[PDB]
Design a protein around this nucleic acid. Structure first.
Ligand code: DCP
Ligand code: K
Ligand code: K
Ligand code: K
Ligand code: K
Ligand code: K
Ligand code: K
Ligand code: K
Ligand code: MG
Ligand code: MG
Ligand code: MG
Lengths: 566, 432
DNA sequence: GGGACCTGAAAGCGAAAGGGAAA
DNA sequence: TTTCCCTTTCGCTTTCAGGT
């Protein structure tokens, strides 16, 4: 018995049929009468009416749609069943396979008797002088919000016995697009024969004109060979790049092929950055020569790059590369690429630390590998020493969450292949200049700053600066920068501002967020260059601001505070 | 007994995404779902509601399915102190014998109203999305939802409602995870009991006959006070870590800042605060004198003094976890009151090289303790984790899954804004 | 102008919180 | 004692791609 809809309200709604152009009206008539012939639609007397219209298929044929917005608003949603595309890479390499696409899928699945009255419509007359003929759907209308859940449930039940009888067959099912793969051509034939029976028993028809048995196959937007896989779509809009909307179109194009063709987040930095500005789709945007170098590099990668069908018996490995901007991950089986794993260009925090990004990526890519092949990787390769992994397990909460229950191997031996050599790396993975603890036998500098724009340090040498800033924090960051410049030696730094202390201690390995205050971005950027250009290490900590306790650190903090008054 | 439907703040469906799981756990999920399908406790679902599920392997090798019902529970509409003119535990005649049922010993199979089943939905995902997910909904209340106090209290009230009425002479009540039925004559009682046993078995409450206990009010009320009593704790600032100027300056900053709130005169910690005098090098050594030690004991005494004697009886408890060095610290609180401190037993700490594991183990242990003190889970656990880090922990950490099994309260990282609680968060405490 | 459901990515912005001065 | 100074972090809107 088929799945009935739940209705909020029984008050019928009438939405007027709208006019159609001759060519489209003929097509509507052509399809509408054929469904009648098949008994998929029936004459209607219902006080409900929804518009119907046509659009072009890729076939070149037309599609009968029902504009069911007002009717859908009265139907309880069902839960979704397939969050994203299957990956072809998990179809075991060198396995013969067949691709099936059911004919007028939604229309072959019956509606519960009582719901048919609600999916009623008006077909205009070929002639503007002659009256309209009215029908209703007895089958899933293309336009109904639950048609997809119902179609998935119906076909899935039909395929379930095929899955059970051929447990060694790889069977992908997306809505009505279906793949079948087996080890041997004989095993594929037994598998397929069983399938034909079961789809027919459920009253579903295989489109014979559109069956695939032979390389090269096309499935869910991918070109699939015996081993090699690439996106079908081999072209990005690069010609006319004058508006915001033009760049939105090109970057959406590139995004879709990123995961298979291996474009790192840093290689698109210049293109992504041009998206910033006026919200109007028609706002002008200039193509920069850096943005163009980026499009050349993408275009070369489209031609060369690929992913690979895997052995069904071997586990996967995860490689994490210390790439510029943010780490990059590759899911791999020995030398064969499965998928690239990438991080967002824009960030949440002001200061996103590279070690937390590694840990986030390992967690996200572990889940993806688990989704692809049903297990963690047997090995995760990280651009970290034994000692740094040890320190990360002790000190990083993100690393602990990232690698919780990871039973395999962590190591830093990358494949000796040349293929990854092009990837642009960073050396700012972990803090090497910024110290966790005070340095031994080192000068102590004390910094402060005021909303009057004055900044100073004191201790073994003194200085006051007039800074352009009207913030105490911004003034003090200029003091901290001057301290890191004027003490070409190991230094300890004590500041009263939590803010200055956290920024200074975190910038070395940080992704600095693009804030709407450029002035602050320039300051954090200068602070970061200052730390990175150091010859010697430094350590910075917080003193509570106005304690008036005894001791030398209070004394010097009070000197700094006086140096930046009035 | 036609089930009454639950009260909801909103009818807007909440969908929390199921995450991929490895085959072994997907196989275990299908196995357990079929087991429950055969008992008629779940059925196939098309709901727009979804709550995530995960499976925990016992050492037996068997799996148990847990559901994260936080999102669904947050939408339950709480009810008021229904049947408040019913008798209190104090008002029974001490000459009467008392029958004691422990609801933790029992098993609950509470049928849901047709309309409520859809809200308790979940998904088993498919490897690689190669097939549509299998979806299901509970036809009986999932056991975790009993940790909502409202639901539990309402259910037992309805279950006891007819037995109480008919047996006017009998006094039958639900006191803090114990169902009590007591009458003056031993045999007048046994009649009342066996009616009740049969009545609540009809509503879905399995009662364990072996586990049942018998005893007088005076023994009960008196033991109850000793069973659920707050542990007085002579808590101290940890001193072994205090070695350098930098250690003392940080700690004495936080002490001096909280000092007014503790009512310690400014001049009265001069021996302590003078330790800052000397070598300006941050790693230069400093030692507490006996005098300085006695001044630290003033701050410890005031912190000890904040611990309440007895909990308020209406208000739920909360748990704060702090990410202190070595091993994490918990504090049980009832809103702004400090109740009691919670630690891992010190012997076990070196066993867990994953700090995350220790957070999870502490939460499980303290949840049990909180249940002992008040009869319920805390309604909030405050952790040093962002919502994204909580979500990743549920996914990756087996320790986290075990520790937060059947938790339906709030998990967040919003700590109190009271000065004392800010001071405790900045300092490290231990109990010798 | 004209349907449904899913996935991923980008920037910008409004809501709410953290901290620590101000009422 | 709550009730505002900002600033930073989080959630959501609004574009683009893509799948049957
Ligand atoms: N733009 C689209 C494309 C597809 N579908 C849904 C309804 C279709 O029934 C199903 C499969 O799409 P097809 O392209 O296979 O269309 P048909 O099922 O009509 O198949 P065919 O053209 O082979 O008859 O997906 C949809 O609602 N809207
Ligand atoms: K199915
Ligand atoms: K950025
Ligand atoms: K900051
Ligand atoms: K949803
Ligand atoms: K209970
Ligand atoms: K879907
Ligand atoms: K944009
Ligand atoms: Mg089709
Ligand atoms: Mg300062
Ligand atoms: Mg005032």
């Amino acid at each position: 018995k088929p799945i009935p809809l739940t209705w909020k309200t029984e008050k019928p709604v009438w939405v007027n049929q709208w006019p159609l152009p001759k060519q489209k009206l003929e097509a509507l008539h052509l399809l509408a009468n054929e469904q009648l012939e098949k008994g998929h639609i029936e004459p209607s007397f219902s006080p409900w009416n929804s518009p119907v219209f046509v659009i072009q298929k890729k076939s070149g044929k037309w599609r009968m749609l029902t504009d069911l917005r007002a009717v859908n608003a009265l139907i309880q949603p069902m839960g979704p069943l397939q969050p994203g595309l299957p990956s072809p890479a998990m179809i075991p390499k060198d396995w013969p396979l067949i691709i099936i696409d059911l004919k007028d899928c939604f229309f072959t699945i019956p509606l519960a008797e009582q719901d048919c009255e609600k999916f009623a419509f008006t077909i205009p007359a070929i002639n503007n002088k002659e009256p309209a003929t009215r029908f209703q759907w007895k089958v899933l209308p293309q336009g109904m919000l639950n048609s997809p859940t119902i179609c998935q449930t119906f076909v899935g039940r039909a395929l379930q016995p095929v899955r059970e009888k051929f447990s060694d067959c790889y069977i992908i099912h997306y809505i009505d697009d279906i793949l079948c793969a087996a080890e041997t051509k004989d095993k594929l034939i037994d598998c397929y024969t069983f399938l034909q029976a079961e789809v027919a028993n459920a009253g579903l028809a295989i489109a014979s004109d559109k069956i695939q048995t032979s390389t090269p196959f096309h499935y869910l937007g991918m070109q699939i060979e015996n081993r090699k896989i690439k996106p079908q779509k081999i072209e990005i809009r690069k010609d006319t790049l004058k508006t915001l909307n033009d760049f939105q179109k090109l970057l959406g194009d590139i995004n879709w092929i990123r995961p298979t063709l291996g474009i790192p987040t840093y290689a698109m930095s210049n293109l992504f950055s041009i998206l910033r500005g006026d919200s109007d789709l028609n706002s002008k945007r200039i193509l920069t020569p850096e943005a163009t170098k980026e499009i050349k590099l993408v275009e070369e990668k489209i031609q060369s790059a690929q992913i690979n069908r895997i052995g069904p018996l071997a586990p996967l490995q995860l490689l994490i590369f210390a790439t510029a901007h943010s780490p990059t991950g590759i899911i791999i089986q020995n030398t064969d690429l499965v998928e690239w794993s990438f991080l967002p260009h824009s960030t949440v925090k002001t200061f996103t630390l590279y070690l937390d990004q590694i840990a986030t990526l390992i967690g996200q890519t572990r889940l993806r590998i688990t989704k692809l092949c049903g297990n963690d990787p047997d090995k995760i390769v990280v651009p970290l020493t034994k000692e740094q992994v040890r320190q990360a397990f002790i000190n990083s909460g993100a690393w602990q969450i990232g690698l919780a229950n990871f039973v395999g191997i962590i190591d830093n031996h990358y494949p000796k292949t040349k293929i990854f050599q092009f990837l642009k790396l960073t050396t700012w993975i972990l803090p090497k200049i910024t110290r966790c603890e005070p340095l031994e036998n080192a000068l102590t500098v004390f910094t402060d700053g005021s909303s009057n724009g004055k900044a100073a340090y004191t201790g073994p040498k003194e200085r006051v600066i007039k800074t352009p800033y009207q913030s105490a924090q911004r003034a003090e960051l200029v003091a901290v920068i001057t301290v890191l410049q004027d003490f070409d030696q190991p230094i300890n730094i004590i500041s009263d501002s939590a803010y200055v202390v956290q920024a200074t201690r975190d910038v070395e390995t940080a992704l600095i967020k693009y804030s709407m205050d450029d002035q602050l971005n320039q300051l954090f950027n200068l602070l970061q260059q200052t730390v990175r250009k150091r010859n010697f290490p430094f350590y910075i900590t917080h003193i509570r601001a106005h304690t008036n306790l005894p001791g030398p650190l209070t004394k010097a903090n009070e000197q700094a505070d006086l140096l930046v008054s009035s | 007994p036609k089930p009454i439907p639950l009260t909801w703040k909103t009818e807007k469906p909440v969908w929390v995404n199921q995450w991929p799981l490895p085959k072994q756990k997907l196989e275990a999920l299908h196995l357990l779902a079929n087991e429950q399908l055969e008992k008629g406790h779940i059925e196939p679902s098309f709901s727009p509601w979804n709550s995530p599920v995960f499976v925990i392997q016992k050492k037996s090798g068997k799996w148990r399915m847990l559901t994260d019902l936080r999102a669904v529970n947050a939408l339950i509409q709480p009810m008021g102190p229904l049947q408040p003119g019913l008798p209190s535990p104090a008002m029974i005649p001490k000459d009467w014998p008392l029958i004691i049922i422990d609801l933790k010993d029992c098993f609950f199979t509470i049928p849901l109203a047709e309309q409520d089943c859809e809200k308790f939905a979940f998904t088993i995902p498919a490897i690689n999305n190669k097939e549509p997910a299998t979806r299901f909904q509970w036809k009986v209340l999932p056991q975790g939802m009993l940790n909502s106090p409202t639901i539990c209290q309402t259910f037992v009230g309805r279950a006891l409602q007819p037995v109480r009425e008919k047996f006017s002479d009998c006094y039958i009540i639900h006191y803090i995870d114990d169902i009590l039925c007591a009458a003056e004559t031993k045999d007048k009682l046994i009649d009342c009991y066996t009616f009740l046993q049969a009545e609540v078995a009809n509503a879905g409450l399995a009662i364990a006959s072996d586990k049942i206990q018998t005893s007088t009010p005076f023994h009960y009320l008196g033991m109850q006070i000793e069973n659920r009593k707050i542990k007085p704790q002579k808590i101290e600032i940890r001193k072994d870590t205090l070695k350098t100027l930098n250690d003392f300056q940080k700690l004495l900053g936080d002490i001096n800042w909280i000092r007014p709130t503790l009512g310690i005169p400014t001049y009265a910690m001069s021996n302590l605060f003078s330790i800052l005098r000397g070598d300006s090098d941050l790693n230069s050594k400093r030692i507490l004198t006996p005098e300085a030690t006695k001044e630290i004991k003033l701050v410890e005494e005031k912190i000890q003094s904040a611990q309440i004697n007895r909990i308020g009886p209406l208000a739920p408890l909360q748990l704060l976890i702090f990410a202190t060095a070595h091993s994490p610290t918990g504090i049980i609180i009832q809103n702004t009151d400090l109740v009691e401190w919670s630690f891992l037993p010190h012997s076990t700490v070196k066993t867990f090289t994953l700090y995350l594991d220790q957070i999870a183990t502490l939460i499980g242990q303290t949840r049990l303790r909180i249940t002992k003190l008040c009869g319920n889970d805390p309604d909030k656990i405050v952790v040093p984790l962002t919502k994204e880090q909580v979500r990743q922990a549920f996914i990756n950490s087996g320790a986290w899954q075990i520790g937060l099994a059947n938790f339906v309260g709030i998990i967040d990282n919003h700590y109190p804004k009271t000065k004392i609680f800010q001071f405790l968060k900045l300092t490290t405490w231990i109990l010798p």
